[PDB]
Subunit: 248 residues, 4 copies
C-alpha cells in the first residue's frame, strides 16, 4: 500500500509516517527543509526496512504539489492513502494585529495545501485500478472551540471539516473515503507550546497537559487499516485534562 | 482490567466484549435473555480463555443496576471500563402514532440505562484505588442526522451526546474519562446478508451498505487501550457509502 | 392565528405569550399552578385585548395533553403555532447523587412533554385546512456545552435537538415547520438583579451576565412571523459576555 | 448608528442594506462595480431618506479594505455594525477540476474579506467611544452540510463558523458581539442533489433574511444571536444524503 503524509518530517506527521511504515506501507513524506526530511526518511526506513521517500514540497504551491504527485505516481503507480497533515500557527497576537503575510501563510499551509493534495489524490485514486483510496485530514480541537487570539488558525481548521465532508461526499461513488482526526495537545516534549504556555478562555497564559504523539499515530493507523467500505468520518483524540468540554 | 459491557450478549456489544476479552480484560456482560447471554459468555470465554461473566439485567431498573454493580464490586472490587451499549431501536412509525409505552420504553433503553450505569461507574471509580476509569458511550449517527419516523430514537441518541459531554466534564478531575462512538450501519454478517430495508430521507425503503462488527470492536479496543490521560472524546465509524454526509 | 405556549404562565414562556398576543395571536398558555396561570392570562389579555386562555395542565401526562389539545380544537378548531417551552432545571448535585425521581422528573419535564405536544400538534396540523403550522422548541445553551453537575439537563436539552431534527424532517411534506431556540442566560429583571451564582467549568460559583426576557420573546415573534415555507431551523440567543464560546 | 454591508450592491446584501437603511442606520455598501453600486445606493437612499454611501472595494484586497474603513472613520468617526456579506460560489465542477484561480478567488471572497473587514472593525470599535459594536457574518447552509462538487464553497463557509466563534470570543471584553447567519436557498433553476441529479429547490425571499439580520442588530451589545439558520423549510438538509 502506498501512503503520502504531508508535513511528515517532524512532530505528529513523522510519528504517523513512522507507524505507517512499520505496518508495511511505502511512505512518502513532505516538508520544506531537506535536511530534516532526509534525516527522517533515513531513520524511519532505517528502523522498518521499508521504503521511505522524502519530497521537499510547499503544499501552498500548485506546481510543487503537482510535481510531488507526479513523482509518487512515477515511482509507485498508485496512491492508497493521503494524510493531509501540513500546517502551521500564527503567534497568538490580537486579531487586528495579524499581518496579511501571516494570514496568507496560514491559509496556504492549513487549507489551500490540504485542498490541492486532495485534488491530485482524487485524480490518482479515480484513475488507478483497483480504483479508490483514503484521505485523512488532520484537523484540530480548534475545529470545535477556539483559544483566544486564534481567528486564523480557528478559521482554517473549521474549513478543514468542511473539506472533509465535501470530500467524503464527492468521493463516495469512487471508493474514496475521507475522514478527519481532531487532535488535542499531542507533543513530543515539553518544548511544545502547551508546556510553554497557551491562552485560556480568560485570556491568561498557562501550561496544559499533553499526550505522546504515539497515540495519534496509533489512531491514524487504525483509521487507515479499515477497508475502503468502512470509514472513520471524524475522531477527536486529546489530552483528557485539557480544557474543552466546559464553558469558557 | 475489569470491563462491563451492557447489552453485550448480542451484535455490536458481543463483538466489543469478545475483542476486550481477547485483549486480556476480565469482561462482564448484561442482557435480558439468559440462554443467549450464557451462550455468548461461554463462547467468548472459550476462545479467549479469560473470565467472561454474564448477568441478566434490565439496565433501566435502578435496583437491578445496583445489584449489577454490587456483583461486580464483590467479585472484582473495581471497574476500569464501562461500555454503555445497551439500547434498542424501534420499527419506524409515523411520529404521532408512537405509543406512550413505546416512547417510555425507548427512553429507558436508550438513555436511562446508560445514565444509571454511568452513575454507578462514577461512584465505583471515584472510590476505588487506584481511582479512575473510562466510560465509553455507544451513541449513533442518529445523534447527528435522523432517518424519517425516528423522533424517539434520534432524541435519545442526541441525548447520549450530552451525557458523554457532562460525564467528561464532571469526571475530568477524578481521572474518569468518557467518550462516544457513533456507529453507522454495523452488522453481523448474517444480519447484513439479510439486506433489510430502511427508510431513506425521501421516505422510500432501500437496503444500505454495512460494515463488520469487528471494526467497531477494534475501535472500542483502541479507545479503551489509551491511558487515562488520553481520550477519544468522540468518533464516527461507518459504512462509507451509506447516505449521511450529503443533504436529505 | 392560534398559538399554544406550554409553561406560558411564567418567565420566558410568559414573555413569549405576551409578545404573541401583542401580535394578534390567540394564545393558549399552560402551567401547573392555577392562580399563577389565571393571573398571567388576565394580565396579558388586559394589555392586548386578545384572547388568552389559561389551561392548567401537566404536559408530562399523556391524558392531560390530550384534553389540552381537545380543549384547543373545541375552541379554536386549529393550531398554527406550538411553542414547547415547559421545562425545568434541577438544582445541581453530583452526577451520582441524582435520584431516580429527579431523573424521571427532568426527562418528563424537559423531553417527554415536548414530544407529546408535538404529537398532538402533528395530528391537528395535518388534519386542518389548510394544513400545516409551526413548532418552536425551547432548547438551551446546554444543548451545546454543559455546566458541571448537569448531566440530566444537558442530556434532555441535547435530546431536544434530536427531536427538532426529526420533527423538521417528518413534518416537511405536511407543511409543518420545526425550529429550535437555544437560550443563554435570559432572565426576568427580578431574577437577574438577584445575582444568583451558577457553576463555572472549574467548579467555582459565580453570577453570570444575563439578558432581558423581551429579547427571546422578540426572537420567537420573528420565527413565527415567517410564512410556513420559511423557517428558522435554529438560533442561539445569549448574554454576549457569559462564558460559553471559549474552552472550559 | 453606523452600518457597513460588504457586497451590499446586489442580492442578499442589498436587501440587508435596504432594511438597515429603513431602520435609520447610515449605511455604507461595497462592491467592485461602481455603476451598480452607485445606483443601488441611490435607490435605497431615495426610499428611506437616510445616508447610503457606495465605496468601490474588493474585500480580498488588504489595501482597499484599509482604505474603505479609513473612509468610514473619516466621515462617521465610528462603526456600530459590520455585515460581512460579500462572497461567491464556484461552479459545481468535479473537485479535481476546480482551477487554482477559482480556488484563490473563493478563498479571498468568502474568508479573507470577512477576516480583513473584521480586523478593521475591531480596531475602530476598540478605539471609538462608546466603544464596541456588532459583527454579523453571512455564512451558509454549507457550513453544516455540503452539496456534491462544492469543496471550496463548503470549506470557506465552514471557515466562517470558525471566524465567528473566535471573533465572539476575542470580542467579549471589548463590548464587541459577533454572530453568524446561515441562509438556505435565498432567492436572488436546478441545483445538485446528494445523488448527483439536478433538481430545483424551494427558496425564501431576501426580505426574510434581511428581517433576521435586522433583528440580530436590533439587540443591545450585551445580547447576541451567536448563530441562526434561516432557510426554505422544504429544501433538503435535515435528512441523510
Amino acid at each position: 500500500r502506498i501512503a503520502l503524509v504531508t508535513g511528515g518530517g517532524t512532530g505528529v506527521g513523522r510519528g504517523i509516517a513512522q507507524a505507517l511504515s512499520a505496518e508495511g506501507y511505502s511512505v512518502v513524506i513532505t516538508g520544506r527543509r531537506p535536511d530534516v526530511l532526509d534525516a527522517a526518511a533515513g531513520e524511519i526506513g532505517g528502523r522498518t526496512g521499508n521504503i521511505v521517500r522524502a519530497v521537499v514540497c510547499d503544499v501552498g504551491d500548485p506546481d510543487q504539489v503537482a510535481a510531488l504527485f507526479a513523482a509518487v505516481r512515477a515511482e509507485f503507480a498508485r496512491l492508497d492513502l493521503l494524510v493531509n497533515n501540513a500546517g502551521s500557527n500564527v503567534p497568538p497576537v490580537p486579531l487586528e494585529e495579524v499581518t496579511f503575510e501571516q494570514w496568507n501563510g496560514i491559509v496556504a499551509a492549513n487549507l489551500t495545501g490540504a485542498f490541492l493534495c486532495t485534488q491530485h489524490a482524487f485524480r490518482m485514486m479515480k484513475a488507478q485500478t483497483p480504483r479508490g483510496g483514503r484521505i485523512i485530514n488532520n484537523g484540530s480541537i480548534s475545529a470545535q472551540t477556539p483559544r483566544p487570539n486564534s481567528a486564523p488558525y480557528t478559521a482554517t481548521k473549521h474549513a478543514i471539516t468542511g473539506l472533509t465532508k465535501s470530500t467524503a461526499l464527492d468521493g463516495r461513488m469512487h471508493d474514496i473515503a475521507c475522514g478527519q482526526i481532531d487532535i488535542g495537545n499531542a507533543a513530543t516534549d515539553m518544548t511544545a507550546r502547551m508546556s510553554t504556555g497557551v491562552l485560556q478562555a480568560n485570556g491568561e497564559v498557562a501550561a496544559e497537559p499533553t499526550i505522546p504523539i504515539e497515540h495519534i499515530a496509533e489512531a491514524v493507523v487504525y483509521m487507515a487499516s479499515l477497508p475502503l467500505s468502512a470509514n472513520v468520518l471524524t475522531m477527536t483524540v486529546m489530552a483528557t485534562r485539557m480544557p474543552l468540554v466546559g464553558r469558557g
